[PDB]
Amino acid sequence: RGLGSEVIRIVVLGNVINWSSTFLEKLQQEDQVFLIDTLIETLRVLIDNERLKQRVGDLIADRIQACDDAQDIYWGIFF
């Protein structure tokens, strides 16, 4: 998180989808997706996540970039 702006979004989106398919937690998943919401928020002013943060991304960035019913919770949390 405290590294930069771009090496996250190039490679890590598919892998968070992967181990969201695997992981099973209740509460630290919430902390994860919410700090990632703030993450993509600080990536907003400087794309799929670009529209997801700027716009709501209703079934555009969510149907494409979100899955596992976890990123949808954060999408409902905020844009």
UniProtKB/TrEMBL annotation:
It is found in: Nucleus. Belongs to the TAF6 family. This is TBP-associated factor 6. It comes from Komagataella phaffii (strain GS115 / ATCC 20864) (Yeast). The chain holds residues 389 to 482 of 485 of the full protein.
